[PDB]
């Protein structure tokens, strides 16, 4: 097999990095839109494991793959920092209003004109009901900053209880994920849920168990094995030709580069694969 990177499908989309020397790296969607990785053509692992192994926290993972919807708690009411574009294609579930003007009545389909009216008047903050926020997925951990105790963790689905707790604790901003059911799908958020690993070490241990079943690894052994998979040229090389092909596929300006992979190489392949699923761009 010639070295390079490949984006294909079966519709279940996939990506594959074939090196000149070393382990293959595969990514693929399942029918539920969760994302999985294979190392050396071995069994599928929820794909976020490789990002954890590369030292990304859950919060950082969510920031790589999602825009944010910011809510504000104030006057014991709830507000949302509004990007009007995000309302496109929806029906209003509450009166969309600002500065004493109702722009969209509850139950009206939100039109291109409504969005333009909001944009023309620079409306960037609107009141929302608690039920609207309860749908959402929180983007970062929050503690009660007086007691120090955790209220919620990153990627948790919000609820009436958690919203009550967040409000009670004195928090005035809540960051959530922007997702939809079309071009901004929640794949990575859902993938974090099926991923049994929770941090870099547990990710490294899981990868080690998969490669070398039957002896639990030391921290040092797990770290070493992972570094040698894709990040040490004595064990992994994309050959110059491989790096050339890789870089052209991912739209790098230069065809020169390293035989080993970078975290950016891996992230960029995952991003492209996700783009394809979201419908921006196509397979090879």
Author numbering: 151 to 160, 170 to 443
Text lifted from the article:
RNA in all cellular organisms is synthesized by a complex molecular machine, the DNA-dependent RNA polymerase (RNAP). In bacteria, the catalytically competent core RNAP (subunit composition α2ββ'ω) has a molecular mass of ∼400 kDa. The Eco and Thermus β and β' subunits harbor large sequence insertions (>40 amino acids) that are not present in the other species and are not shared across bacterial species.
